[PDB]
Amino acid sequence: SQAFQRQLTALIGYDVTDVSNVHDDELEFTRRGLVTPRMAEVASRDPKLYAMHPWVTSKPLPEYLWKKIANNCIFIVIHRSTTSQTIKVSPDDTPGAILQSFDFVLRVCGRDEYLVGETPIKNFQWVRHCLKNGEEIHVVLDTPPDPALDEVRKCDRKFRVKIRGIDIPVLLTVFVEANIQHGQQVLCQRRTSPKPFTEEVLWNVWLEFSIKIKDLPKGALLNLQIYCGKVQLLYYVNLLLIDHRFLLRRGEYVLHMWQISSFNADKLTSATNPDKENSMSISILLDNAEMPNQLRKQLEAIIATDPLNPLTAEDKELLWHFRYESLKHPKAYPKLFSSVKWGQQEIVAKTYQLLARREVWDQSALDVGLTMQLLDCNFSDENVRAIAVQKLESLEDDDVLHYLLQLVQAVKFEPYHDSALARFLLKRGLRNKRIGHFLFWFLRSEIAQSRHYQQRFAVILEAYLRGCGTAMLHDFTQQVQVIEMLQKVTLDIKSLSDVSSQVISQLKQKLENLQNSQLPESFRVPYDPGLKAGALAIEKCKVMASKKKPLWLEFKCADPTALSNETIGIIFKHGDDLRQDMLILQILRIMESIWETESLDLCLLPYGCISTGDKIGMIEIVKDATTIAKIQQSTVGNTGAFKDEVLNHWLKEKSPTEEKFQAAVERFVYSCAGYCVATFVLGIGDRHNDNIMITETGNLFHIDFGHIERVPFVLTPDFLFVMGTSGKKTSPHFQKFQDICVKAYLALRHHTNLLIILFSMMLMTGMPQLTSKEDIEYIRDALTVGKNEEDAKKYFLDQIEVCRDKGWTVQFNWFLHLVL
Numbered sequence: 110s111q112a113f114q115r116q117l118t119a120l121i122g123y124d125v126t127d128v129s130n131v132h133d134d135e136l137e138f139t140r141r142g143l144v145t146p147r148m149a150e151v152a153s154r155d156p157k158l159y160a161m162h163p164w165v166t167s168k169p170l171p172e173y174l175w176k177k178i179a180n181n182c183i184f185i186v187i188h189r190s191t192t193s194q195t196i197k198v199s200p201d202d203t204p205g206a207i208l209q210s211f212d213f214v215l216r217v218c219g220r221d222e223y224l225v226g227e228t229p230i231k232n233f234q235w236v237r238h239c240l241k242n243g244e245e246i247h248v249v250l251d252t253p254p255d256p257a258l259d260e261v262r263k264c265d266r267k268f269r270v271k272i273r274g275i276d277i278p279v280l281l282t283v284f285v286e287a288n289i290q291h292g293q294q295v296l297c298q299r300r301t302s303p304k305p306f307t308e309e310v311l312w313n314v315w316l317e318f319s320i321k322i323k324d325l326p327k328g329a330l331l332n333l334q335i336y337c338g339k340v341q342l343l344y345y346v347n348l349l350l351i352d353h354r355f356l357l358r359r360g361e362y363v364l365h366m367w368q369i370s371s372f373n374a375d376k377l378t379s380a381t382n383p384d385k386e387n388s389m390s391i392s393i394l395l396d397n398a399e400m401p402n403q404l405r406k407q408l409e410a411i412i413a414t415d416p417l418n419p420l421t422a423e424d425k426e427l428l429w430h431f432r433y434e435s436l437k438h439p440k441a442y443p444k445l446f447s448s449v450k451w452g453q454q455e456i457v458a459k460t461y462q463l464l465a466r467r468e469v470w471d472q473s474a475l476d477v478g479l480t481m482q483l484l485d486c487n488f489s490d491e492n493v494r495a496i497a498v499q500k501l502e503s504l505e506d507d508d509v510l511h512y513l514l515q516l517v518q519a520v521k522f523e524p525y526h527d528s529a530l531a532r533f534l535l536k537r538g539l540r541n542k543r544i545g546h547f548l549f550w551f552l553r554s555e556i557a558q559s560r561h562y563q564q565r566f567a568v569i570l571e572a573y574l575r576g577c578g579t580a581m582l583h584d585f586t587q588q589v590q591v592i593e594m595l596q597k598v599t600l601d602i603k604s605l606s607d608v609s610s611q612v613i614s615q616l617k618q619k620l621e622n623l624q625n626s627q628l629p630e631s632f633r634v635p636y637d638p639g640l641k642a643g644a645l646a647i648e649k650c651k652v653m654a655s656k657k658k659p660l661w662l663e664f665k666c667a668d669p670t671a672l673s674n675e676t677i678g679i680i681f682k683h684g685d686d687l688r689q690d691m692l693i694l695q696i697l698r699i700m701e702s703i704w705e706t707e708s709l710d711l712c713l714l715p716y717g718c719i720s721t722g723d724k725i726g727m728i729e730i731v732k733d734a735t736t737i738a739k740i741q742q743s744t745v746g747n748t749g750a751f752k753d754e755v756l757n758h759w760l761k762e763k764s765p766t767e768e769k770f771q772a773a774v775e776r777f778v779y780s781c782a783g784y785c786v787a788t789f790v791l792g793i794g795d796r797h798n799d800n801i802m803i804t805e806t807g808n809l810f811h812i813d814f815g816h817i818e819r820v821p822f823v824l825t826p827d828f829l830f831v832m833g834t835s836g837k838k839t840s841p842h843f844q845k846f847q848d849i850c851v852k853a854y855l856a857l858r859h860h861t862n863l864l865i866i867l868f869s870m871m872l873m874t875g876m877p878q879l880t881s882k883e884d885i886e887y888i889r890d891a892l893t894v895g896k897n898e899e900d901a902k903k904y905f906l907d908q909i910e911v912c913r914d915k916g917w918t919v920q921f922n923w924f925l926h927l928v929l
């Protein structure tokens with residue numbers, strides 16, 4: 110009867126039950142600790158609302174979508190068997206108000222989405238999406254899905270550590286470095302004598318630290334590092350000094366260490382290397398008045414600075430002395446708690462007194478940017494971090510999905526496997542099938558390709574699955590099977606490597622074979638859990654010309670009520686880290702919803718992209734779209750004598766009518782403006798011509814973000830000749846272009862803090878290469894912190910006037926680079 114546990118293993122892609130790589134019982138304690146939060150949210154959720162999961166928002170409907178509505182009236186076409194009749198509806202009308210307009214529940218045609226619950230129809234996401242693209246809200250009169258399908262299975266000494274020695278099975282002078290750590294701050298540091306580097310080095314040394322046992326804070330790491338020499342860090346490993354039972358660590362440790370290929374999230378992990386046979390190990394032993402004017406200004410200038418501006422000792426001493434004034438400002442919080450001398454018992458006590466009186470904090474409107482900072486690598490105190498998770502509680506489900514990726518990554522900054530943030534995600538996952546779905550893949554993604562955090566994420570996922578219900582479990586099981594069957598086919602085809610013609614039949618042969626053998630004939634599309642894909646479309650399946658040879662696959666829609674003929678196009682790629690692409694795209698989504706708060710819609714295409722396993726995942730195929738290079742290839746040819754008039758020409762020939770050409774050119778100016786701003790800010794602006802795409806309908810969009818004389822971003826004359834210009838001129842559309850860009854840019858600057866943090870966290874948990882202070886401190890320059898609105902406008906307009914002044918130089922330089 111434990112085959113349920115064996116199933117969970119195969120759904121997770123890691124066995125929680127295994128204990129070959131522990132040196133204590135933290136993981137198991139956290140399994141057993143999560144049972145309560147699991148069963149609480151399970152028991153408290155509404156069965157029917159959980160089944161239908163209405164994807165709803167509570168946000169204002171922006172200016173752009175109102176001016177689309179035909180005067181306080183919205184048409185909704187309802188379907189029976191084949192009896193479609195349209196109905197007049199007012200933005201405020203309830204799903205209930207339309208059910209007694211003419212127990213049956215409304216379901217979107219084609220999708221596994223529902224229009225139910227006490228919110229107006231203007232508050233449903235599906236409706237807002239129809240209007241966005243200008244489409245009609247078709248919906249079937251259905252039976253509510255059965256909740257039964259969702260059912261669940263039921264002391265004043267100084268600290269000291271003895272370094273016995275290091276041991277490596279295989280393989281010129283080496284020394285161990287021991288740091289008492291706390292939130293990236295190193296509190297005390299001791300070194301060994303440097304011995305000769307051989308497969309085994311013994312020291313038998315007591316390293317006396319100056320910090321006392323009482324002064325140790327919970328969440329402090331003993332960080333053991335190995336340097337050789339000209340010095341270089343070669344190996345690292347960590348050990349929580351205070352354990353999950355608030356107990357001081359004691360005894361003998363043989364800890365297997367991580368190697369090395371500046372901040373990186375992997376460097377913080379309490380996980381030990383699972384590879385006993387190849388990794389370096391270490392052997393250790395634990396036995397053991399109210400303020401004046403001039404200063405208020407100084408304090409307020411400090412509070413004003415961006416999250417990345419370093420505080421000096423002077424700044425910190427001031428913040429701490431004025432604890433209580435600093436407390437009256439929610440924005441002082443990250444700076445204030447980074448002024449705490451965490452390696453001093455009485456100070457932390459005072460810090461806790463200060464926390465116990467956070468009336469201003471608790472009453473303030475949620476600031477996601479501010480909250481995030483408290484969950485990054487700079488904070489190891491659980492009580493500090495808990496006030497952040499506290500603030501997240503108020504997020505509506507719609508806003509969790511916006512931040513879900515980075516909150517899931519934020520877990521890599523937690524000292525302990527059991528944390529407020531982990532419980533939060535768990536809770537908010539079990540309450541909403543949608544958050545649940547994505548939470549599953551997000552965790553699975555990291556479990557597959559990261560040893561530093563798989564053990565932890567696996568515990569959190571198992572906790573989630575044990576509460577999602579039989580329906581979800583079946584769905585998940587079905588999704589895994591498919592991508593596991595398909596990934597095998599991708600790896601095999603890549604090995605038969607220009608694309609052969611016989612190899613297309615090789616692919617089509619194996620896809621036919623799977624159609625019978627084991628493949629489930631329907632599954633949820635992981636990047637769009639609304640859509641259920643069914644049987645394949647073998648004729649349309651191929652291998653793309655790309656040298657990473659990905660699978661272009663198309664699927665029939667398994668839902669008969671689907672009111673379309675279009676297949677479901679998924680790319681299957683191996684060879685790249687798609688985790689990076691997810692992050693960028695999710696930031697892109699954040700950028701959009703920001704622009705929504707100011708009634709803008711810059712028509713980005715942040716297509717679906719899920720990293721399913723090790724260096725291999727899947728991607729949404731945008732319909733009726735092609736790359737900019739191919740447009741230049743069909744008129745100009747191979748070598749690329751880039752012609753300025755080809756794009757607008759291509760837009761004309763894909764525009765059916767004059768009516769559609771206006772809205773196409775207009776969607777280009779919008780989408781182009783967004784991608785120029787977004788990429789400039791993220792520093793992924795200077796991009797190859799073949800990495801940018803357009804839809805037949807005007808929508809531009811960048812692809813392949815994981816791909817990473819210069820230029821700010823991509824603004825070329827062929828783009829500009831859709832904006833009545835070349836070299837030196839100004840049209841009514843180019844004025845609009847600048848009028849959208851400069852407003853998009855200072856619009857992001859109204860959210861500087863948030864993007865800075867999101868950027869930091871992205872580099873630390875997802876870009877495992879360089880990421881030093883300097884890497885991160887690019888977005889400060891890009892967003893011109895401190896600079897006024899007027900100066901920054903001229904900064905961005907100069908960027909344009911570099912792309913203008915560069916013409917084709919950079920695109921051309923890519924050609925001599927990539928192609929030749």
Ligand SMILES: CC(=O)Nc1nc2ccc(-c3cnc(Cl)c(NS(=O)(=O)c4ccc(F)cc4)c3)cc2s1
Nearest residue numbers: 655659680716729730731732733734799812813814
């Ligand atoms: C109608 C049509 O063709 N629509 C498309 N829609 C999308 C949506 C996304 C992507 C895409 C995005 N990111 C990465 Cl990393 C990739 N990787 S890839 O290897 O498939 C690829 C790398 C470059 C290159 F020029 C073509 C494909 C692919 C490609 C396409 S094609």
